[PDB]
Amino acid sequence: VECPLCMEPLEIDDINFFPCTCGYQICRFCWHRIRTDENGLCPACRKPYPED
Partner 1 sequence: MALKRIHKELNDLARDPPAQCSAGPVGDDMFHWQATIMGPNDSPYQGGVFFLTIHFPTDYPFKPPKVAFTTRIYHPNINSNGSICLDILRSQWSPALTISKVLLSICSLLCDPNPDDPLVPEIARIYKTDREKYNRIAREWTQKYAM
Spell out the residues 6+ positions from residue 17 whose beta carbon is closer than 8 angstroms to its own: 11, 25, 26, 27, 28, 31
CB of 13 to partner 1, least distance (A): 19
Which member of 13, 23, 46, 52 binds partner 1 (CB under 8 A)?
46
Q: Does 11 bind partner 1 (CB under 8 A)?
A: no
> Of 8 and 51, which CB lies nearer to partner 1 in the complex structure?
8
What distance, in Å, lies between the first and last C-alpha atoms of the chain? 25
> Of 5 and 17, which CB lies nearer to partner 1 in the complex structure?
5
